[PDB]
């Protein structure tokens, strides 16, 4: 800071603490049901997937 | 028309040939009993003349449920209850369903449902044709505004009548709407030519009001051009109560009947005029 400043760089990060991290399995992110869209699609694949 | 889905199903899960169904045929081919080539089962090889024999003499027993459940997903997807695209997954689903609670008793009201569903579909066609999806809603576009009660003139019971003829008679089934508040006629599904139905707001206080024949451009000359639509759309249906002095809305009719009468008489020597249609004049 000032005048005689030294040679600087720059940090950045965040938080958010809380929270717990989301991924929704909807097509979209959205929330456009409690049974999203991809979990039905699942239903009628009728087959197991790893 | 839409299929049979039985025929649909059959053609789709069963022999293409001889099967151990048509024994009735296999027992004329062997017997050399078939008008058309008695011979020809005389001169198989003994390696397939033998083994026909045997299916012939004590048939092969099969399990029918494949072809009965697909009789309904055939079916299902005609009568568009599921995309096309579904019909191996909709299938399946059906096949674990009644394989995993299996009895004779399921067995005889699939049957019952394969004739259900076949009947289903031949109705659905009848009721795509029949139009009465839109006399049921033209029928209940006439309770949303005063029914058998005009003013100036009572013509407003045969322009109803010409409403419910028109819409009973035109092929392409003339849509009528609910909208989502006000009702519609779509006349033919590619809907240029659209009306708006609850807009005969005008078409209320015109009832009885006299021509002032000499120009049309006049003081009453009220009519919004949805108005005239509507007017135009049911014009071939509206001869009775509708002559030139009975009202200005009865002498537009006389001038679209006979408007309609030019555009068709016009289109017979228009396809005449362009006999050539090419550079001789």
């Known amino acids: 800071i000032g005048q005689t400043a030294v040679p600087s760089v720059t940090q950045k990060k965040f938080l958010c603490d809380r929270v717990m991290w989301r991924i929704p399995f909807s097509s979209n992110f959205m929330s456009m049901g409690a049974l999203t869209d991809l979990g039905q699609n699942m239903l009628y694949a009728n087959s197991a997937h790893a | ?281």
Do not use: C
Not at chain 2, 2 to 17: E, H, V
Not at chain 2, 105 to 130: G, M
Not at chain 2, 167 to 190: A, H
């Open chain 2, 1 to 281: 028309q839409a299929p049979d889905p039985a025929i649909r199903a059959a053609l789709q899960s069963q022999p293409s040939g001889i099967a151990s169904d048509d024994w009735e045929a296999a027992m004329q081919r062997i017997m050399a009993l078939t008008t058309r080539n008695p011979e020809s089962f005389r001169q198989q090889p003994q390696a397939n003349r033998l083994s026909a024999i045997l299916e012939a003499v004590v048939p092969s027993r099969t399990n029918p449920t494949h072809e009965k459940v697909l009789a309904i997903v055939n079916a299902l997807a005609e009568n568009k209850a599921i995309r096309p695209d579904e019909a191996g997954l909709v299938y399946n689903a059906l096949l674990e369903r009644v394989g995993r609670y299996n009895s004779t008793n399921v067995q005889s009201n699939l049957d019952r449902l394969v004739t259900d569903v076949r009947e289903a579909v031949a109705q659905r066609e009848r009721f795509k044709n029949e139009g009465l999806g839109s006399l049921v809603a033209l029928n209940a576009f006439l309770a949303t505004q005063p029914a058998n009660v005009p003013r100036g003139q009572d013509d407003y019971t045969n322009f109803i009548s010409a409403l419910r003829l028109m819409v009973t008679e035109v092929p392409q089934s003339e849509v009528y709407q609910s909208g989502p508040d006000y009702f519609f006629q779509t006349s033919r599904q590619g809907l240029q030519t659209v009306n708006l139905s609850q807009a005969f707001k005008n078409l209320r206080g015109l009832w009885g009001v006299q021509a002032p024949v000499g120009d049309r451009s006049t003081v009453s000359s009220l009519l919004t051009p949805n108005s005239r639509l509507l007017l135009l759309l049911i014009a071939p249906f509206t001869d009775s109560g509708s002559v030139n002095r009975n009202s200005y809305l009865g002498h537009l009719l006389t001038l679209y009947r006979e408007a309609i009468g030019q555009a068709q008489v016009d289109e017979q020597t228009f396809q005449e005029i362009t006999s050539v249609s090419r550079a001789l004049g």
